[PDB]
Design a protein around this ligand. Sequence first.
Ligand code: MG
Lengths: 141, 83, 48, 393, 107
Amino acid sequence: KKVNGTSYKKWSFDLPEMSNLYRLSTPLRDEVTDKNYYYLFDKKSFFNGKALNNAIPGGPKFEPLYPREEEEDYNEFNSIDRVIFRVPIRSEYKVAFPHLYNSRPRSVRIPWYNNPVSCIIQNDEEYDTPALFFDPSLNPI
Amino acid sequence: LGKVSSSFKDVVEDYCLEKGYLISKIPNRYTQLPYGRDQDCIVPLFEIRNGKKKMEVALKHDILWVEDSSGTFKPIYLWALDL
Amino acid sequence: PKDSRMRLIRQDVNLGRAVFWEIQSRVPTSLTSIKWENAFVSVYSKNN
Amino acid sequence: VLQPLLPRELPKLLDALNKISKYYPGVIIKVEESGEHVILGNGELYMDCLLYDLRASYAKIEIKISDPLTVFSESCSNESFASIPVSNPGLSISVAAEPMDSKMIQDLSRNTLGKGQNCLDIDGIMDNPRKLSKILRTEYGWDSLASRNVWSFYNGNVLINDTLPDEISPELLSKYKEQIIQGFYWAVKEGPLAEEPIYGVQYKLLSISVPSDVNIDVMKSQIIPLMKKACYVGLLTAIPILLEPIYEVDITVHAPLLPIVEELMKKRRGSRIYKTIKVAGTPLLEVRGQVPVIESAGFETDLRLSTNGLGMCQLYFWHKIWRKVPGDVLDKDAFIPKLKPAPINSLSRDFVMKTRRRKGISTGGFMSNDGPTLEKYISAELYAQLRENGLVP
Amino acid sequence: LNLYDVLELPTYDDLPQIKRKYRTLALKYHPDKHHKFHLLSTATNILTNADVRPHYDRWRKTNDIERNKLIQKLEESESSTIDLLQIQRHGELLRKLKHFNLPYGDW
RNA sequence: GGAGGUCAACAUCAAGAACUGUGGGCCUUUGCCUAUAGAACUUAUAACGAACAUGGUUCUUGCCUUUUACCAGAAC
Ligand SMILES: [Mg+2]
């Protein structure tokens, strides 16, 4: 039942075993239970970081990928007289909405936007608390 | 010329008043504009009616442009307009 | 930087090339050679 | 604001914008005198969806894009000491204007059929002016005489008649009424300051003068532009002002992170939070608040990061609220920060002096400084009298 | 497939030459020794009379037509490759009067 | 005959979001249209591998006497 054979591929288990293994492995387990925690840390935010030559404050630094910024075009378009300086347009924004805030992106990918805001609730404190219980964190209804 | 407070469009309006023609903005439509440069400006256009005739004018720089019959705008003298 | 660089405005630029044009003319091309390329004109303007 | 990067490729970009307008219905595309193209869309993410479609699928060219900006509107605070008449002098007009009661506008932005005791939306003009007048006098403590006096309205505002020749010659005016409403729609679609829509401004028509012999097609045309200038002139003496849209922000967070949220609000400058609603059963909070449209450029990601991924935001307009921008719309002495955010003491002089530069109405060598001035329409001679009394700032 | 293609032969032959062609082919592809010959018989039928042979050949040429198309394309390609100031100025004058307020002339 | 094997051989595994067979009609086999049967494995925050190395050519750099050995980006 527990495995294919001596050839040893295709394992199959039961629930309680996986519960114990899941218990033992806590120091090496991933531990992060929602997608939404990685917001600008997924891959596509890093690629978009590289192509646009920015950095997430904890992310990696690469080379430019488009070494020449130096060419500048002068036209009435962006002139100061016609612009309103409100909000700084700081760097984190460029990676989130790359086609909007970043003029002239290239090799940019679409970042995935949002997830549903995990409310997941668990108790690792008491083993004798029931499975279904109304947790003090919740609002009183 | 930069000093002068008044703006053309105003002049056009004044001219129109004497004629009794009415100038209306027309929001969406626009026509590509050819001016000296090997480039075409884009400008919004308005239509003026004497009774129930509609013709469309786009003004860039200090000029009035009226479309040729086949199509494409041609600059014209302000006195040169009679509808 | 761009902000504190000289701004490009018709009054300004045209003054620059005007002055450079006249002084360009005064000296004969035989004695020396004065090209617009090498020259720098900075205009201090109400706008600059 | 779009511009194509390589100018010679403009004729391609145009052909893409004719597609996008179809495909994304909500988008509104405008082309200006500057030739600046104005894209108007619901928000951050929406502009992103376009610009990706516009760079990738439709027009393969690449394009330069401005900072996220907003749309203003123009209104009047106060009244019209002056009640001046403007003639294009066979026709002499005097048009007063005053603010509308907040409740009235609040019931206009929401089209409403007056079901039960609800205030009817004014859209029922074809209905009996006695029923409609019953609605107004009933709900608003509205004027009894004006209720009957009202002619017609438009999206942001209504028009009313108070004058003696109405009592002397109602018919001769009833001829050209349909002319005056044209001048009115023309008046509202543009504006005195930024040439942007007028909103919440009640126009009471004080007077109209008509020439001898009358006319046939002279009275047809000559009325519209003069009526327009009568509406601008009516406004500019009322204490005019620059309106900025306010998003109704809706936020959802875990409870203990509530303080963090609050900080962000205090930073934005537009906005404050009306409500904090416990969500029964879940460890969540709905925080309802408001922020200006022009201030909201980066809000969402600010929030979503700052709380470490717990939490959320949405920005939306329904109510189509608006609010005064804390400056005074016409002032020469406002401080223009030049590359800094202006001090709240004057933001309105800023926004208008900018939009004016964008919409090519006002010409300066570089920074034109021409105010929307009442003076131009009156003629100096009246103007000189007006300035003596401190009427004009 | 051309009659020449069917016989696997190359392209003004005489009535005599027409006979000789068949004779040569007969030696090579003799049916009694080794459907194709049906073509040979028919074409030979007209080719054996010099008149029919000539008329039949009268009606590579098409390909020449290809050359003509190429030439037409080349001709099209190579040959093809090989007041405003006054107006705006008048408008500028017209605005100046409006500014100065001097009455407009009847333009 | 059933279970297996740290056994082998031969097929197949990156594409019009995509496979194959068969029935019928048109052109003259291909191809198009229509009808019907079955589709293992791999793919949507895209892929056989919930993992992750090296080499070649060509550009751009970086160290900087020159070559191997190299710096870090790209395309194939
Ligand atoms: Mg050597």
